[PDB]
Structure formats: structure tokens, C-alpha cells
Swiss-Prot record, chains A, B, C, D, E, F:
Lineage: Archaea, Thermoproteota, Thermoprotei, Desulfurococcales, Desulfurococcaceae
Domain Thioredoxin: 5-162
Main location: cytoplasm
Cystine connections: 206-212
Annotated protein name in UniProt: Peroxiredoxin
Description of how the protein assembles with itself and partners: Homodecamer. Pentamer of dimers that assemble into a ring structure.
Gene3D superfamilies per UniProt: Antioxidant, Horf6, Chain A, domain2 (3.30.1020.10), Glutaredoxin (3.40.30.10)
Length: 244, 244, 244, 244, 244, 244
């Protein structure tokens, strides 16, 4: 095994060097009232990492629209990072606009538990989604061999943000859940007094005292969510390789 | 601040009580040469959890076609599990065909590190993807308030199996990656002599020494993957609560 | 091979989650000047436990008349508890008015020694009778396979209360003792004086120095108690399965 | 707190001195295929204990009818045991047919956890129901100041034996349960499949997959049980104080 | 071996439960100005002990006349002590005036070294003769099998009181000594001047320097003693067995 | 605060210097099949000790007839023992037949706990009565100031020897007990079977279950016993001082 920070803990305090200069996590993001997705990759100048970083750049304004910043992690140098970014701009025509953490001896890696058994020296494809309070809201561990579905990360942070906003719980596959479509869920009641009270109010739709829901999501909220998935699903019109 | 087993490690050898009887992990699945997805949820008779089991159930057929068995996990007794399975069948019309671990003391949860600081007692929405060799291939930790995208887990397993058999890495957002679409990446070369040999071989497409792909996935394997993501994106015709 | 709190000891301080919310034992019931009977059962949605919970419910008023609150305890979740109470409301037409502690990591079970060699995960049929001072006055440990006789818990609480207020001890089988029927016993002399003085006063009936009694219980007290045992003893008029 | 033996363990191995001789527990009873009730009491030449010993005495033939021996426990000298047995036979005309353990150094008291906070020198009113395999089946800790209800102890072994004999769980207040009367519960299913094999079968009366019962006990078996409770209920016609 | 209090040591400080209620040894008898005789015995309702307590009772006046209180001791409950005194009065017609300590743990027994090799649980026939100042003056240990000669116990206290008050030593078998009859001995001189001065004064009878004596006891003091030994020697008038 | 040998322990092994030569205790005496009576005394050339040795001396034949040798004990030299013995022979005209131990370093004093708070140098007036199996049967500790009653030591050995051979216990003040005179007590029964078999047999006279006796002592044994106490009681005809 190996240690990781846990959902509901504040992200570990740490000063990191990135290719945008030094930043203290998670405060930098907290102080701007912003979320950050931090995401690790094994090595600059490798192809899946490239496809991955292009995906994240291609959706930068989708993440800016939600008040979420991006930050890569990798044990390559700051000089390695800027030359890789220069490659991608040159050979693919994409500026990579967000900073990348440099971590040469593996300190930040070790701290976030990003060294698994594939490799003693290269991080896995780890994802830490953090809220404006500086709290880890979700963690994904993808291997070396498999690139992430960046659109699922978007659905997470939108869904989470509606949840806290609307005091609600998000069903499976939202906003295309097969039971209650784009319905958000009301936290199950923890006493019999709330159970009965809630039922009597008919302020909600109900399958039973625990499963109560409604559609407080704005039309645009739901479309923002559904675009994320339409895009994930859509075969690409042109490929960025046919202009390189 | 929490211990977990790691990508590349054997799934911890344990015996567990399920509402289908006692089974050894990962032994039970290795014997049959099946992969398995093990997912946790905080309690029976909660609503986000109910959506997840129904999602997993509607896709059971899909998982079975890949050779993936499913197994749930929570701290509730077997007697809750079967009473919650019964409730779902009478209210939503869906039989849940896969076993659910019962872990009333939190033994299995502490061993897989599914007790995050959202709860001392209730498991978070963990996902372990284990191959037929009994090795953890991917781990997802969603929280209490957010249901999972079950179609992403299908993509993950499909991609990972494809990667293994074709001896390839899988680009971001496959099979709809913006650079090489449904192409699979040749693992990056680890010497310049190799890199040069590869370019001269002529037999891959290449953006550079370290970025070669081809399209070795069958037409069918790709449309299977593409269906997963499209189902995820579609707004459903019939909601399941309606015909209660 | 197990530790338990002892008769004469204050019930141990603990905050507990119940399906009526968080409460501190024994402080919650001491506050109100009330006795309480905490009782435990293996698991929700199990038949014997169900029969027991009905039987306690049907005697709720008998217990309220005595100033006795009831509280349940299992390792099932608050969401299992309410789902069950509801099953009982709808299948049997009986509403469980008293709270049930949920205790999903076995903290309370372990603290009260309610885990015995029949099961490591599920609690035996323990009964704790605590007076209004917060003191443990009786303990019953029944097993999985055998339901309790609730009327005996009624008899136990009633007699103890009489005993307390009347400064009297209570013969076997009270108030149907073959030697003194509904009599109550003078605590035996602890000296020769007390013995020869008592026998000289005609305050009491006697068989010897140490066996002295009187009949100080109101005919109401004694009918309350005999009413309990008569119910225990009577083949029931109609079953609750019959009008389901 | 203080340590006790637990339901489902072998009765601790011990050689005890009784007023019938030295015997080994549980071997003496086991080797005769007999169950035993070991019950304790603070002191000889005290009135409540006296009501209790007379209470077991009048029920000796009903215990023998069930295959059950009795044995007492007190820190008094085997000399006190006989004098006190004499007194009772003299001044009440009842002979106490069964042994009483002498425990002058409270060795057996301490091994059985029968010295509570009440008295450090005198045992509480403990009851260990031990079966034909020397396995503890039930424990009951009554205080100094409250006689036991010996017929509940008859109801317990009667029910345990029926449950053993017929492979059944005994409902609350059996054989007069408000729900199924004299019915005996089929232990609930532990898997989704066993659960459905039960219902489709139609072999038993059911409220749901977990709540299944039949009437396997004989009419003599049920009358025996009832007789016990009716004896508890029925007001005594003659008191034994009337013929000192 | 075993530990005992020593002749010349202040009686150990202790609070005892007795059948006349709690008292504090030796201060209880010190503050009253009285000597006391503590005597252990094995067990209540045994015959030797019975004979000894009657012998003590039948001499209670002789002892009170001398300013000496009796107190027994044995491991039995206060409750046996009362029943045993009651039997002695009903069957033999003597009532036991003096207290009997209850030592049901063996605390006083261990603390006075009265648990000897014959029995781990029952006390031997110990005797402590404690003076006005609360000092142990003499100690006798008789076994289980041999009742004491109580008139020797009276001789001892009488002889000590004359010794103490008259400033003298008491010869062998006083007051019937082969050599000096009722005479009391002048403590041997400890110097030359003292031995000279003694011989020359003829203040005493003397066989030599060290052996000197006079007769300074009153006729009462001597007759009171001779009478103790007379009682011991004289076969009894009428036996207390031919009346009950 | 003193270690001593116990009733029921073998007298301790030791090689000792006496004025009849060196002897191994208790082996020297267990060899001859003879009991023995060890009596320490403060110091040679002191008056009480002399009167006590004269007394022991005058009873030498009474002791020999019983099968019982004597050994005195004292921290003075062999040479003081002989010089003192000679003084007695000259001045009182009694030869001391029995040996006396010399203990100048107080080893034997120490080893038998005869060094009490009266004096840390001079042993008190202890009496060890040892049987032919070399086992301590009785102990008496007297002080400096109080000479022993040697007739009681004779009564003890006679009574003890009788009780051993006859398999009886000895009442108080035997052979002149106020209840049963010269009777000897059947040791009390330990079972209920034994107790009532006794009552109906009429093998013995009985006050109750536990109290039975008979007169199995020969006329000679009783007179021997009763002439011991006669002597104690009787005012001596001629004192031995008168002819010095």
C-alpha cells in the first residue's frame, strides 16, 4: 500500500515550483475564491500526457466558466515543461495556458501518493479536485497506459458546484439519470420526524421517505453539463494531426 | 492521511460476506479469468446509492460482454442488502443481478481505505478496477453527494483490455481524441536508436520520435466504446420512476 | 472472555446517533427524571428482532405509565432503521415510537460487551435496565435464536420501583410468590438487636430473625404487575398476521 | 466494568465443591447428556434467596422433564448450605433436591463475573443456562433486591430445545407472540437466491423473504410452555406461610 | 511459613463488619478502657466451634468481671453468624452475648496469619489477648481438630493484670506453682549493686540473687484464679445435651 | 510483622547444638516414632524460666508415657545450660532429664519467629507441638512475664493423640465439656447424603445434622486427661522453697 490525502480533508499545505513561478497550495486558489483541478502525469515528452494536456487546453474556457483553475504535476524540470509546451504550440497549434508543477526528487508526488507500483520515479495519472475552501472533493487514479476523459472531470466540478449551491445530491449519470433525469436529490432524512415532515410538505417528488428529488437546476446549468458529455461522445470532425 | 492499495498491486487477499454467499478476492474472479469492478457506497436505503446500483444494473449486460463481474460494498448487514434489492425491484422494476459485500464492522473498508473524513462509519464512492491477473488497474474515489458516471467505468475497462491485447497506450478521451481520434498510441521509445528505427520502419503514423499511433482496434471494439459515451450523453426517452 | 458494565455502576457516558437524532446516555433520560431500557438486536429486517420490536411497541404505554423510556441498538444504519420501522407500519400496522441507536462500527456494542461468540459483527439480545439516577439495575443477555419475554422486563422495572420507594426486597415470582404471594420482604437484619427488636415489634410477619415481610403495595400496584404476567400467559385473541 | 463468559462459549472448565460433593463443570452434566442452570445468590440465611430456592424446588419435576439439572452458587461454607437447606425443609416443608456450590474465596464468583458493584463479597442473582454440549446459551444478571421469575427460565430452556430440535428461531413472548402466536420462525435467508427459492416454494407462511414461519411444535410442547407462564400469572391459592 | 502480628506490637489497625455492626480494632476496646480476646474458628454450624462459643458464653461474666471483652472471627457471612447464634440458643439454651466478625474475603485472616496449612479458606483456632493500651500480650494457635481450654485464657488475662498492676512476673502453673505456690516473682536484677541490695534487704523470699518472690495478690485475686482451674478440672454436673 | 511455621507444615529441617549433643530436627524424633514439644524461653538464670523447667521436669514421666520427648531453646551457651541445670539440681533437687538447644546467633529463634517486640535478643516463651510425621499440630506464644501452664500442653498432646487414633475432634475444655463431657465429636458431614445417613443410623448421639458425638475414649485415657487438670487446679501440699 501507500498513503493519500482523503476526500473531506483540506489539500496538504505546500510551496511548489511551477513554470509560472512559485505558488503555495491550496491558498493561491483559495484566496481568489477558486477551485483547482491538480492532475499528475508520468513524463513530459510522452504521447498520452500530450493528448491529455491538449484535451485540458481545448477545454480551458469551459473550466474558466466554472471558476476552476488547472495545474499539472510531473517530476520533470521547469525547463523540460516549457520546451514540451513549446513543442505542443509548434506541432499541434495549442498554447497550454495553465502552470505545471516541477517536482524533481518526487516530494509533492510522495505527499499526494502519486507513486504506485508501476513506477518508483513517475507519478500515475492522478486527479485532485479542490473547492474554494481548499477541500479535496474527489480523487481519480488513472494508470500510465490510459488517458483521462477530461469531460468527466468537468461534469464532476459542475455537478459538485450545483450540489453545494442548491443543497442537493447528484444522481448517477446526471444530468441523464434513467430514474429522475436531470433531477437533483434531497439528502436522505436522518430522523423519523424529518421523514414524516418532508412527506407531508409535498415540496418534492418522492419514491419513499429517503428518495425525494426535484429540478432546481437552471436550463443553462443542465445544457452546460450535457455539452460536456455530447462532446465526449462526438466523433471528431477534423483531427489536429492532419494539419501537422 | 489514509492508507490504500495501489495501481500495479495484487488486490488484497480477503474473504468477504456478500448477499450471494462467501467468496475469496481476488481468487474467485481470477479462477474464472474475469476482471471485476468493486465499488462502495455509504449505506443501503439512500438515494444517490440507489441510482448507482440501477445504473450498474442496466449496464450489467455490457460489463458481462467485456468479461467484467461487478461487486458492491457497504457496512450494512446482508439482511439490509436483500431488503434494499427487493425495494428497488418493487419501486423501479429493476433486478440487481450482482453480489454486494456486507462489512458491518468496517473491516474491508479500512483494508481498502474507503473511510475518508466525510464519514467515520460510511464508505465513500470508491471504484477498484481489477484485471483477471488480480491486479488493481485504476481507482476512483467519488464522494457522498456525487453519483458516478458508470459509462466512464465501461470506457475505462474497454480501453484497458484493448491496450493490453493490442500492446498500446490509449489517448485522452478515446475513442474520440481530438488529435488521433480512435487511434491507439505506441508506447514511447526509451532510446534514440529505437525512435529512429520506428520512423524509418514507416509502419506507424508519427508526430515525432516519441508520438506514433496506428488504428489496430477493430471497427466493432470502437463502436462498442463509442456507444458507452453516447448512452452517457443521450437524454432518456422514458424515466424509470414514471412506470412504478 | 468478554467485558461488560456491572449492576450498581453508572451506565457509561456516550453520545449515540439514533433515528430520533443524537443523544447522550444516560444524561438524556436522567435529565427527564426517567428510567430507560436499552436493548439490542443482531440486525434490521430479521424476523425474531421484528417480533420483539412490535412486542415492545404494544407495551409502550405500560412503560410510559412507569416512567420508563425504551431505546433500541443495532449495527445497521439510521437509513436501515427507518426503512424497517416503515416495513413494520405497512406490513403489521404497528408504529415503533421509541428510538433505535445506529452503531455501524460496533463502538457501542463493544463498549457494552454485546458482541459474544455467536457473531463478531452482530449484537446479541442484550437488555440494560438503568434507573433515573443513571445506575444499571439488571442485565439480560438472550441469544440470536430466542426472543425475549417483554412482560418480564415490565415486571422487573415495576418491582424495582416498589422495592426502591418502599425500602423493600422482592420475593421470587412477585407478586405470585408461593410463600408470601404479593408480600414484600424486609431487608434482613445485619445485627442481633435489629433481629430481636424487629421480632418484638409486630410491624411484620416472620418465619425467623432474617425472614420478615409485610404487604405495603397498593392493590393498584399489584394488579399492574399481575396484569403484565396474565398477558404473557394468555394465548392471544387474534394474530397480527391475520389482519395484514 | 468486569469480565464475564459469553453466549456461544464452552462453560469455563472448573472443579467445584458442592454440598453433594466435588464435581467438574461442565463435564458432570455433559457426560449425562444433561443441560444445567447454574444460578447464584448473595448469602444463605436471607429471605429473597430462600423464596428463589423454594421456587426452583417446586419446579424440579418440570426441569427434570426437560433434561435440565440445577446447581446453586454462594460464598457460604458447605456447612451453611446444609443448615440452611435444613431450615427450609423444617420451617416450609420443602426439600431442596439439587446441589449448591460453596465458593468461600469467590474464585468461581470471579471466573463467572458474578461480583458486581452492589457487593464485593456477595454474588448477584446470576443465571447461566448451559446446554448438553456445555455451551452457554443465555445469561441473566438480577440484582440483590429482586427475586427471579423462575418460569421465564423454564420458558427459555423449553424454547432453546424446541429451536435446536426443529431448526427454528423463537419469537417474542412465545408461545403467545402477538404476530404468529405459537409459530416458530425459519432463520432468515442469507443470499438473494435462497430468499427467492423460499417464496416460490410456498412451503411456509410468509410476510416477506426474511419473515417465514410454521407450527412444527407439538400441542403437548406448546401446552408445557403455556403451563409455565400461567403458573407465573395465576395468584397463589394457598400461601406456604400458613403451615410453618 | 506465614506472617503474624508479634507479642508487644500494637494490634493491627482495622475496621471489621461484626454481627453487632462495624467496629474499629483495637481503638473500640482501647477507648472503652477494656482488654479484648479475639478468637478465630473454621466455620459456622460446625460442632467444635459450637462447644467453644458456649464455653466462652458460659464464662462471659468471669471475663466482664475482669474488664475483658470477647470478639470471635470466621470467614462466614454476618447472616450465618445470626442464624448460628439462634440455633445455639434454641438447641442448647445459651445465647452468645459477644460479637462475631465476618471476614468473607479473608482480609483479617491473612492480616493476622490465621490461614494455616490445614485450609486455604477456613481460619485455625487463633487467640489474641490484647491489653488496655491495644498491645498483643499472648497468642495461641490451636488447630481445627482440638477445642481450646477457655479457663487457661482466663488464667492468662488474670495473671497478666496482676503482673502489670503489681509489677511482677508469674511463675509456671500460677497460682499452684510446685516451688512458690501462689507467689509472684520479682523480675530478675540486671546489675551487681541490685543483686547485692536485694539479698541484704530481706524485702522478699529468695532462693538466690535472681530468684526472689512475695505474695502481694489479694485472696480474691488468687481464689478467682484457683476457681478458673477448678472449673476446668471438675467433670460437669449435668450435660446440656439431655435438655433442648 | 514476623515469619513463623504453620499448623500442618513439617517442622523445619535444622542441625542444632544441645547439651545432649547435636541433633537433626525433626528427624531425630520422627526416627524414634515419638512426638516432641519445643519450648523456647528468654534466658538461663532467670526465675520464671526455672519454675517452668522444674514444671516440665516434674511431668517428664507423664510425657514419656504419652510418647512425647522435650527440647528447650535459648540463646545462652551449652555451658550456661549445664551450669543452670546444676544450680536447679542443687537448690531445688530436680534433675532436668530433657535436652536444651543453645542458639547464640538466634538462628533457630529467627527461623521459628520467637524473636518478638518484647526483646530482639531474647526469644519469648514459644511452644511447638510436633507429631511423629514431624508436622506442627499446635503453637502457643507466651511472653517474658507469664509462665506457661504445662498441664494444658499435656492435655493438648493427649487430646490430639486420642483424636488422631480415634478419628474424632475434641470439644472445648475436654474431657470436661459442659455439653458432652468426655464425649468426642464425629467430624461434621460435608454432603446431604452423609448428613441424613448419620441422623437415622443412631451410630452416634446428635443435637443435629452437623453435631454428633460418642465416648470411644477408654476409662484410662479420660482419667489421665482429668488428673492433668486436677494437678493444675490443686493448691500444692508442700512448696519446694521450704527445703533449700
Amino acid at each position: 500500500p501507500g498513503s493519500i490525502p482523503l476526500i473531506g480533508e483540506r489539500f496538504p499545505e505546500m510551496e511548489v515550483t511551477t513554470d509560472h513561478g512559485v505558488i503555495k497550495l491550496p491558498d493561491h486558489y483559495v484566496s481568489q475564491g477558486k477551485w483547482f483541478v491538480l492532475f499528475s502525469h508520468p513524463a513530459d515528452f510522452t504521447p498520452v500526457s500530450t493528448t491529455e494536456f491538449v484535451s485540458f487546453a481545448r477545454r480551458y474556457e469551459d473550466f474558466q466558466r466554472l471558476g476552476v483553475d488547472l495545474i499539472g504535476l510531473s517530476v520533470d524540470s521547469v525547463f523540460s515543461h516549457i520546451a514540451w509546451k513549446e513543442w505542443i504550440e509548434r506541432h499541434i497549434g495549442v498554447r497550454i495556458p495553465f502552470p505545471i508543477i516541477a517536482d524533481p526528487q518526487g516530494t509533492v508526488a510522495r505527499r499526494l501518493g502519486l507513486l504506485h507500483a508501476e513506477s518508483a520515479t513517475h507519478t500515475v495519472r492522478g486527479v485532485f479536485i479542490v473547492d474554494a475552501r481548499g477541500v479535496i472533493r474527489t480523487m481519480l487514479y488513472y494508470p500510465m497506459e490510459l488517458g483521462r476523459l477530461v469531460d468527466e472531470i468537468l461534469r464532476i466540478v459542475k455537478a459538485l458546484k450545483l450540489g453545494d449551491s442548491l443543497k442537493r445530491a447528484v444522481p448517477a449519470d446526471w444530468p441523464n439519470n434513467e430514474i429522475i433525469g436531470e433531477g437533483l436529490i434531497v439528502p436522505p432524512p436522518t430522523t423519523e420526524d424529518q421523514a414524516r415532515a418532508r412527506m407531508e410538505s409535498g415540496q418534492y417528488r418522492s419514491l419513499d421517505w429517503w428518495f425525494s428529488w426535484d429540478t432546481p437546476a437552471s436550463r443553462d446549468d443542465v445544457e452546460e453539463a450535457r455539452r460536456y458529455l455530447r462532446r465526449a461522445a462526438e466523433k471528431p470532425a477534423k483531427l489536429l494531426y492532419e494539419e501537422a
